[PDB]
């Protein structure tokens, strides 16, 4: 072997120019798409809010058009999924992880138009889904499409142009390039065998998209939280604890997301119409709540800022928590096209802030500011449910910019992943693949 | 297929023993990383108190500078040449081998050698970082526990080896994230699957960072304040700055290698022409660290000043060349210590320069050299050592200017891209290929 290694060392980091140049066109496309989508979604959430003014008087008529508009879209979505691309439902992450493993197909000619216009309806209706799902997937297929249209051959090409389309996609989501790369190489990638994924190709893709996203969403952070205070050394142990808690709760949230995934399968039992109709239902429920207590509906981005700031009361936090835990499952588990990635950040923020308030009054001699805990937690749920801590911590960083809380954010996140292991939890998208992969056999 | 389904359901399950051990490693790695950084400091101090003692008679002082630096430099080169020939130079290439199972981890040797070794080379003012000493001392640390507790299994030997490396790279630049990104983009077996438990690495890194924070709190290694921002029409400029680091990245590789040979002749393997050729360069550095410090020492001290635009165009170039020189000499000379840090300083300085030029060229971009200085700082590390992602994040973790993330990346990528299309190679991989080929021949 030693002589082989010496052969390889001297040949390390040499990616075929074709691969590199293609990772570039991918990232570019992924970006433009990620943009048009984020723009459509926004456009609808707008139209939707312009109809409520039209009928701003008659409260019940308004509460009505809220539900209806959200229902009508949500359905149009669920439909487009159930009817032309059953894969394109739910996350999309678990699916793309499969294709990297060569266990699932990448029917881009389908998913693209489906997941796209699909989530356009689910997100654009105010459902509790992030953009990750829609993009990450749309991203990868993007890369696939180029693979095929240019007929690029070889494992590297199929595995690389698939991985960049994923990262580009996760980047154009949270305008977080590093995270997009850390994601692939800590999660996306074939977790048990060596792979021909050229990191340097990923980068180029990520870059290109981040650049296209910067071309249209400049001067407006998704989450602005300002520079928080600092965290003294004698304050650290508290973020450990906050971690442990996210640790025992991480798996638990996993059971519910999975279990509810089933309990909701009965309601329509595989029937295109009980689905489409059960979707428009949850959908409308959200377009409603997004007017009578928005902090429980929609993406979730909007309340992180408010939460971190200590603007909510203990009561209002808890409520938002539970109400969100509910709306979350309902929309994801229901197999609606969209990520559970973003909404998980929100749950974290809120849960953290709460732990904070308590912390504060408990120890006035620490001079705490709930907002730090809110940030240690923001990505901790992602660390105990989706089990990709390092992608989380860096996903938080890239968006909150409080690198002075690097120690807490880590200790919380680790503490989460450690207890989400010693309580038997599992990588939520791995487990979603194991099911999808095992359900693909069991019926034979 | 059925196998994967078995594995998925079994992903991310690290044996509690492994985890608990990564923890003790990190802790140790830390405390060590601390006592080393403290020794080095202590000596650089003593050295400076002797120059006051003989502060008058200029030549007597220029003398005691050289001598104190020589005397330690030798004491070092000796401890390496005499009891642990592996512990000379970086240490990185070595540890990368052990992960590949192609080299031994003679901790019972390296530990006391590299440790007190660099204590002399660093503590004398040589152009070497702390990475080398620690990264290595780090992994050996993890080896030592492996053995003392008899932990068995690939995972255990590969994991407790990788954490000791990360914990080590962390406590170096108080940069946890980097420490972990390093392992998983560089250190690790580049061509086959491995049993390295990321979650184990973390715990270690943490523990050390926490130990480092217990003693170096409230004092950044590099304070640069919040720099300006970078407009979108200014980006292409950092692409160019990258290309440049791209063609110069390989070239600096040749010199580091080549000078590694041209310095082998001078002593030809002789313990005494080495020890004496080391205290020679060593004394040279303790001298320059008084008649133009910006060419000697770790290099950390001048990044701040550089980024700030406090140096003139002339003074920059000079510090560059002068440093390119002192760098090679100390590393290539196989003295114990990293070329990791001094490569940052070269980056800063090269960037700042590209900046000043940029500024005057385009007053309508309202540039501030300091930004290019930061896009470069780790661009060398991206074109020489070919670990961009570890670099970018290594810079980040220490400059804190996340608003320059786009530049830093485009520079760094542009570096690694041209250091590829101009034939260069991962400097610590090529150093292993040499050390590994000089073994089976």
């Amino acid at each position: 072997r030693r002589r082989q290694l010496i052969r390889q060392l001297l040949e390390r980091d040499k990616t075929p120019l074709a691969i590199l140049f293609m990772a570039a066109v991918v990232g570019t496309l992924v970006g433009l798409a990620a943009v048009a989508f984020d723009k459509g979604v926004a456009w609808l959430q707008n139209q939707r809010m312009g109809a409520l003014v039209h009928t701003a008087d008659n409260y019940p008529l308004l509460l009505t058009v809220a539900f209806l508009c959200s229902a009508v879209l949500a359905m149009f979505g669920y439909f487009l999924v159930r009817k032309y691309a059953p894969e394109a439902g739910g996350s999309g992450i678990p699916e793309i992880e499969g294709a990297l493993e060569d266990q699932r197909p990448v029917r881009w000619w389908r998913v693209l138009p489906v997941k796209f216009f699909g989530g356009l309806g689910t997100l654009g209706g105010g459902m509790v889904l992030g953009r990750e799902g829609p993009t990450v997937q749309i991203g990868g297929n993007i890369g696939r499409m180029v693979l095929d249209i240019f007929r690029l051959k070889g494992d590297e090409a199929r595995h690389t142009l698939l991985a960049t389309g994923a990262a580009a996609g996760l980047a154009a989501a949270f305008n977080a390039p590093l995270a997009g790369i850390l994601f692939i190489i800590e999660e996306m990638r074939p977790q048990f065998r060596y792979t021909l994924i050229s990191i340097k190709a990923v980068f180029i893709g990520v870059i290109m998209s981040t650049i296209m996203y910067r071309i249209f969403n400049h001067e407006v952070a998704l989450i602005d939280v300002g520079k928080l205070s600092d965290a003294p050394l004698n304050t650290l142990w508290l973020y450990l604890i906050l971690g442990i808690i996210f640790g025992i709760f991480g798996p638990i949230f996993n059971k519910w997301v999975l279990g509810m995934q089933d309990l909701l399968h009965r309601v329509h039992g595989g029937n295109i119409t009980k689905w489409v109709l059960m979707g428009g239902a949850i959908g409308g429920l959200c377009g409603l709540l997004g007017f009578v207590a928005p902090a429980t509906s929609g993406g979730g981005f909007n309340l992180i800022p408010i939460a971190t700031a200590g603007n909510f009361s203990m009561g209002m936090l808890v409520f938002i928590f539970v109400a969100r835990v509910i709306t979350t499952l309902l929309c994801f588990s229901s197999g609606a096209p969209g990520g559970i990635f973003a909404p998980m950040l929100a749950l974290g923020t809120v849960l953290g802030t709460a732990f904070g308030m308590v912390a504060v009054e408990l120890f006035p001699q620490y001079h705490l500011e709930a907002g730090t805990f809110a940030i240690a937690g923001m990505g901790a749920l992602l660390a105990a449910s989706i089990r990709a801590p390092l992608t989380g911590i860096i996903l938080v960083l890239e968006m909150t910019d409080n690198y002075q809380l690097i120690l807490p954010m880590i200790i919380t996140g680790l503490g989460a992943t450690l207890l989400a292991q010693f309580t038997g939890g599992k990588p939520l998208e791995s487990a979603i693949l194991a099911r999808t992969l095992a359900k693909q056999e069991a019926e034979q | 297929r059925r196998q994967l389904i078995r594995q998925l359901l079994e992903r991310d399950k690290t044996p509690l023993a492994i985890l608990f051990m990564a923890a003790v490693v990190g802790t140790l790695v830390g405390l060590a990383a601390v006592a080393f950084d403290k020794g080095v400091a202590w000596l650089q101090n003593q050295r400076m108190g002797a120059l006051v003692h003989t502060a008058d008679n200029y030549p007597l002082l220029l003398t005691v500078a050289f001598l104190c630096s020589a005397v330690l430099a030798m004491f070092g080169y000796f401890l390496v040449r005499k009891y642990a020939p592996e512990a000379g130079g970086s240490g990185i290439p070595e540890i990368e081998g052990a992960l590949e199972d192609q080299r031994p981890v003679r901790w019972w040797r390296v530990l006391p050698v590299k440790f007190f070794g660099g204590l002399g080379t660093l503590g004398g003012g040589m152009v070497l970082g702390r990475e080398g000493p620690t990264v290595q001392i780090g992994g050996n640390i993890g080896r030592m526990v492996l053995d003392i507790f008899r932990l068995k299994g690939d995972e255990a030997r590969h994991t407790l080896l990788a954490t000791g490396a990360a914990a080590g790279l962390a406590a170096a630049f108080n940069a946890p994230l980097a420490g972990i990104l390093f392992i998983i983009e560089e250190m690790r077996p580049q061509f086959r699957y491995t049993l390295i438990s990321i979650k184990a690495v973390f715990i270690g890194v943490i523990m050390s960072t926490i130990m480092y924070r217990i003693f170096n709190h409230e004092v950044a290694l590099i304070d640069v304040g919040k720099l300006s921002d970078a407009p979108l029409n200014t980006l292409w400029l950092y692409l160019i700055l990258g290309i440049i680091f791209g063609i110069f990245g390989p070239i600096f590789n040749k010199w580091v290698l080549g000078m590694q040979d041209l310095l082998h002749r001078v002593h030809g393997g002789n313990i005494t022409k080495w020890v004496l050729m080391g205290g020679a360069i060593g004394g040279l550095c303790g001298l320059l660290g008084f008649v133009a410090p910006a060419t000697s020492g770790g290099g950390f001290n001048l990044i701040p000043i550089a980024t700030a635009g406090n140096f003139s165009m002339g003074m920059l170039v000079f510090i560059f060349v002068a440093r390119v020189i002192t760098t090679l000499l100390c590393f290539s000379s196989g003295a114990p210590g990293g070329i990791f840090a001094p490569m940052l300083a070269l980056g800063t300085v090269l960037g700042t320069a590209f900046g000043m030029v940029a500024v005057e060229l385009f007053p309508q971009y309202h540039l501030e050299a300091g930004t290019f200085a930061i896009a470069g700082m780790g661009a060398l590390l991206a074109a020489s050592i070919r670990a961009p992602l570890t670099g970018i994040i290594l810079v980040l973790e220490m400059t804190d200017n996340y608003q320059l993330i786009l530049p830093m990346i485009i520079t760094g990528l542009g570096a690694t891209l041209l250091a590829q299309f101009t034939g260069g190679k991962p400097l610590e991989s090529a150093i292993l290929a040499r050390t590994l080929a000089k073994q089976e021949a």
Partner: antibody
Amino acid sequence: VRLLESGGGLVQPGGSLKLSCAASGFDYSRYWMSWVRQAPGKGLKWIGEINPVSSTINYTPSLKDKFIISRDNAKDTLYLQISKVRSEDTALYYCARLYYGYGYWYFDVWGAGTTVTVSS
Amino acid sequence: DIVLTQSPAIMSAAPGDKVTMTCSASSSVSYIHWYQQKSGTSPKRWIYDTSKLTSGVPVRFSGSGSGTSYSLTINTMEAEDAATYYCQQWSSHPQTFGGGTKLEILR
């Protein structure tokens, strides 16, 4: 770094006075400011503290509104209102910027302080 | 709230002498601070976190202690060492101060 507190002086029993502290030589925000007082010939006693955004304001165990610590980061000034002043309030009042090492806070920099005399 | 009691309330020691003052706590404290106050001037952070010297504090000054007993020490107390030293804790809220120890130049 300078802390100049003023406002002190003669106040009639039962009256109220507003002490001021002009800060300069550092970013007034980011810092927790605090008041401490020293009664003639006696020890130091903490009055209270106020965080940067005034979201937290704690006082030594004392009467409900006896003290009112406020701050105006726009003027880099700290304020301490005392009410129902009685002889016990006669003392030198010091404003101090707060900080810490490991985390157990201390009174970083003190000012020269203003003397308050409660008498008729 | 924690009661810090400084042992010698008043003490005299000739220059160049090991001087040691105690700071006992009613309950348990950790990382207490020490302030030096010269007649006519504001207290000055001298020692913090139980033993760290504030920038500018001569090395003859040292402090140590734990749980319920701490002490500030001067290995060879100089003239400009005459002052009142106040210990302070904040390991518990609200922070409290010692009665202080007046260090006077015996002659």
